[PDB]
Amino acid sequence: KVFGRCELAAAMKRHGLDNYRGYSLGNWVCAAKFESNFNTQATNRNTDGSTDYGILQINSRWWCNDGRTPGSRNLCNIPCSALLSSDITASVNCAKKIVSDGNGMNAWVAWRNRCKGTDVQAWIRGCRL
Ligand SMILES: CC(=O)N[C@@H]1[C@@H](O)[C@H](O[C@@H]2O[C@H](CO)[C@@H](O[C@@H]3O[C@H](CO)[C@@H](O[C@@H]4O[C@H](CO)[C@@H](O)[C@H](O)[C@H]4NC(C)=O)[C@H](O)[C@H]3NC(C)=O)[C@H](O)[C@H]2NC(C)=O)[C@@H](CO)O[C@H]1O
Numbered sequence: 001k002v003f004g005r006c007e008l009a010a011a012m013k014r015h016g017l018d019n020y021r022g023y024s025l026g027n028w029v030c031a032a033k034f035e036s037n038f039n040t041q042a043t044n045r046n047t048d049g050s051t052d053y054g055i056l057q058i059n060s061r062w063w064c065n066d067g068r069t070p071g072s073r074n075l076c077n078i079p080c081s082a083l084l085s086s087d088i089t090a091s092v093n094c095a096k097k098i099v100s101d102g103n104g105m106n107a108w109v110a111w112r113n114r115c116k117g118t119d120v121q122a123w124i125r126g127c128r129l
């Protein structure tokens with residue numbers, strides 16, 4: 001799908017991301033533009049061999065099953081193709097766990113450097129929320 005500046009993000013809040021498990025949900029919306037650029041079908045492989053999926057940009061190596069990830073924990077226990085559709089309603093369970101390791105955003109590559117210390121309230125701001 002193609003989601004605009006004010007239309008793909010009001011749904012983080014419909015899923016409990018608001019201020020959940022210590023990260024403020026204000027801090028969240030910026031990074032999305034940095035991982036798949038508001039696209040729920042944009043995916044790529046990893047130069048280390050495990051492909052990634054979604055706006056989420058996650059690989060089947062440590063987290064889900066795509067069948068090409070051996071030595072994969074499949075900690076998500078769901079097909080990786082189970083998130084890339086227009087609908088995204090159940091795709092957050094695993095996202096809701098990825099911060100539980102205590103690693104935080106240790107997984108999101110763009111945020112720690114593109115959205116870490118940025119004017120992020122300048123990212124979620126302006127839409128009605
Ligand atoms: C191309 C695209 O679309 N996406 C690419 C991504 O594939 C890639 O992303 C990151 O991939 C790395 C590789 O695994 C991953 O980092 C490691 O994540 C694990 C678990 O999530 C962490 O391990 C836990 O450590 C804790 C703390 O010490 C331990 O308690 C625990 O024992 C560990 N877990 C288990 C179950 O053993 C690591 O801490 C972490 N790396 C380090 C060095 O700490 C990220 O999760 C991936 N994130 C995403 C969103 O992909 C990215 C690489 O930069 O490239 C993208 O392009």
